[PDB]
Amino acid sequence: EVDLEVYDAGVSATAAVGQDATNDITLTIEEGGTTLSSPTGQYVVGSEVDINGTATSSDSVAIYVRDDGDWQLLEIGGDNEISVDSDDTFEEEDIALSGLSGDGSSILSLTGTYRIGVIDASDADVGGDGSVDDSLTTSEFTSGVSSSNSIRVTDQAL
Amino acid sequence: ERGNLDADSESFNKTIQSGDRVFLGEEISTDAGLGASNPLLTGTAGNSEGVSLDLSSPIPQTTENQPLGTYDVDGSGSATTPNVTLLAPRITDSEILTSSGGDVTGSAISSSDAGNLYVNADYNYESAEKVEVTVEDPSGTDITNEVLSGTDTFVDDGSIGSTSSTGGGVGIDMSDQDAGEYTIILEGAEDLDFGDATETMTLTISSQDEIGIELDSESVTQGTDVQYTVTNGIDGNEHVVAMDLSDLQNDATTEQAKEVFRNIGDTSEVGIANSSATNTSGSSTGPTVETADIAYAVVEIDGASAVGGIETQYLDDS
Amino acid sequence: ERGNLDADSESFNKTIQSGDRVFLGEEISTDAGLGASNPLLTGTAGNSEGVSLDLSSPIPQTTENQPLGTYDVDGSGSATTPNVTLLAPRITDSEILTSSGGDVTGSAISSSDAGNLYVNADYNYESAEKVEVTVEDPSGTDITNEVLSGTDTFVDDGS
């Protein structure tokens, strides 16, 4: 909870530290939920799917995949980010997760149950150039605003 | 002084001398000058003859009770002695231009590039009063001190097209502000702020969301022309809309592929291009339909969006 | 030149000479001519006497602050010397006619026969500036370059 205190007219800045406020107003500060919707539940290996989700307070978002270790970055392509509209919603076209180049995609190639999460631009190369180019660990991924959901990949039969 | 206002770092002066000019809404100063040495003035000719001009009081407006013209001390007569001509206050042209030119008024601009904007105007009243600039947020609050960058809120006469702070014009750094539609207000320093002396220039700030494209229809048949619009682009620059030749019908010819994009709208050139050369609609000299691989139409933008068109005729049903 | 605008393939000219005509919305050029040799002008008679005309600045409109009439260098006096008369800009009549006559403005026409249409107009300002033609679709987009056939978008007076 965050408060704002006003003071009577003519009071000085230094002398206003001790005098009580004439009135007040309070507001609450939390962090917005940035979650994914479509890459959840099931995924056929080699298939293409869109990236669907929402982000209340975000400008650039990145998608990471984890399996018994580091969160390997998934190279979605252009600028490795997705913009967010005024409706606090971000979307991407149909992307083949395993098809795309990068070591992040290589984890999802093999059949199993994994985890996929999204993170805001708060990383920014964990400090440095304005680009998402790292493999954030568990502490780094969790420290910023993020969310992850369980995903498993199934075999493809024509 | 008067007539050279910035020479003394003054935003205004009301010490009128003989033979100078006076505007409709002024408030003459009765101190030393032609405000205590000769407070009563009478018209000379035209509609203003006989009518009196009281300098000790504020001057009326809208060309009623104070006709425009030269004023004598004696009236219509044989004397040409302490003297005032009465003009009208005016703002003629005003624009918002980026650091390298390009009007951006009334058009949405990217927040990243909206950091070196300039405001310029031409006004009739340069001898009397400078014109103020006041940036207002969509909520309606004076944010001028936050966005001001230089020139001290005063913009000189002329100086339209001045892309540098050296010339007249004030720079505003609107990059930090959020997305919204903003209004820049221009008006005189003290008195000349009524109609025809003030102008509100609007400005839209919105995210640099990737260039937006929309179609008036998504499900169409062959032969039906479809209009495509490019949205949220930097004004004065040439985009390229591409067409993959794989979607083209196999039995098409070279001249049959150069007419997929029409010259409708803001389109500049149409044709088919390759990694080495291009074949425009002007002549069939570059790559052929089998030789080329892309169909393009370079399109500019005027304002916030530009519109083009396509011919869905001779397109694969997919 | 000025007064014979198409003689030099120019769409406009702002080099005013003595005794010529000037319209309400013009923007005089301060280069060689009567824009640097005599930038200050004063009225002669009628409602325009005494009123000044600043050629170095754009001229106001709607017959306010700039009355119509002849302007001297000396004002109402005994001099008839560098000189400007101020008229008003006007378009009087304009029609769309088929290749063999017949006005078709404001009336539906067949697409097959709408292939040799013409646009004509009469305007007051022929010495100063030509008048442009811009065809707009119902969606509101400039399609002039697609439908243009000749005359280079400039239509002459009369005709």
Residue numbers in the entry:
A (entry chain D): 353 to 510
B (entry chain E): 35 to 352
C (entry chain A): 35 to 193
Sentences from the paper on this structure:
The entire outer surface of many bacterial and archaeal cells is covered by a two-dimensional array of proteinaceous molecules, a supramolecular structure known as the surface (S-)layer. The H. volcanii S-layer is essential for cell survival and plays vital roles in cell shape maintenance, mating, and many aspects of the cell cycle (Abdul-Halim et al., 2020; Shalev et al., 2017; Tamir and Eichler, 2017). This S-layer consists of repeating units of a single 827-residue SLP called cell-surface glycoprotein (csg), which is highly enriched in negatively charged amino acid residues, highlighting the adaptation of H. volcanii to hypersaline environments. Using electron cryomicroscopy of two-dimensional sheets, we report the atomic structure of the S-layer from the archaeal model organism Haloferax volcanii. This S-layer consists of a hexagonal array of tightly interacting immunoglobulin-like domains, which are also found in SLPs across several classes of archaea.
